[PDB]
């Protein structure tokens, strides 16, 4: 996260760290959507241009964390993956269209003050909140600049008008993406950055006071560049896919 602040303890209890077994390192962010399911960006698991194709056994999820590098004894829980599912029409060749994956955990994770799932939006929560000007929240342990943070970082960013998103870049933007960030005039800044991918863009519903995951940190052109924005996977648009995988392979 570029130009954020330290998370408060328990502020993002659905935040998951995607951690490489060997070498020991952070791969990406992720989010906890139930006791055995974790949501991330497909490109955190599968991105051929960089020779990346992880299997279940290459990876761990670390849930309940605040510190990046510390083993948070009595606080975090570390889980092994039973199965990875990448969206069958994830477009890693062109523009990261449908940058979404699910990870079924080997065992249920226990909830706590520090571990708790986020909601996924329904049609109406999306229609209502996915509006230009409305701010969401992005958290992760990624680079602080285009060094690295001691603890989980947070930034609140405005959703941006779609023609403005499109006119910031040469990449073809699809309906499965939205962009967020402040404009050059606005004074305020901030963006996700490397290692933040797969993490959640969330919003707190003013109606039922619940946090919903509206986006997944997908891509940017640099980090916190003026005239450039972060691009997020439109989670509600892929929820039929989410629901299929879970109805079929969940218990």
């Amino acid at each position: 996260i570029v130009e954020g602040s330290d998370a408060e303890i328990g502020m993002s209890p659905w935040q998951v760290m995607l951690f490489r077994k060997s070498p020991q390192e952070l791969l990406c962010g992720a989010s906890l959507i139930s006791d055995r399911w974790v949501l991330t960006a497909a490109h955190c698991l599968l991105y051929p241009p960089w020779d990346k194709n992880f299997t279940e056994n290459d990876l761990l999820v670390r849930i309940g964390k605040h510190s990046r590098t510390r083993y948070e004894r009595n606080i975090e829980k570390i889980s092994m993956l039973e199965k990875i599912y990448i969206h069958p029409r994830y477009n890693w060749r062109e523009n990261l269209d449908r940058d979404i994956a699910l990870m079924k955990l080997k065992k249920p994770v226990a909830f706590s003050d520090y571990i708790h799932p986020v909601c996924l939006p329904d049609r109406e929560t999306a229609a209502s909140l996915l509006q230009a000007g409305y701010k969401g929240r992005v958290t992760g342990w990624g680079n602080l600049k285009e060094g690295q943070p001691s603890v989980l970082q947070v930034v609140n960013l405005p959703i941006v008008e779609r023609p403005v998103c499109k006119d910031s870049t040469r990449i073809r933007i699809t309906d499965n993406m939205f962009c967020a960030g402040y404009k050059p005039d606005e004074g305020k800044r901030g963006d996700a950055c490397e290692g933040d991918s797969g993490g959640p863009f969330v919003m707190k519903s003013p109606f039922n006071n619940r946090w919903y995951q509206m986006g997944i940190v997908s891509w940017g052109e640099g980090c916190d560049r003026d005239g450039k924005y972060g691009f997020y996977t439109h989670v509600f648009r892929l929820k039929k896919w989410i629901q299929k995988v879970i109805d079929q392979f969940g218990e």
Partner: peptide
């Protein structure tokens, strides 16, 4: 999806507010 989703034990569950959530609410105009 779960009945208790999106309600944080250390904030919503205790009726405590985090330092910047009001920035979000203020944007929902």
């Amino acid at each position: 999806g779960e009945a208790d989703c999106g309600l944080r034990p250390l904030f919503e569950k205790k009726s405590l507010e985090d330092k910047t959530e009001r920035e979000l609410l203020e944007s929902y105009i």
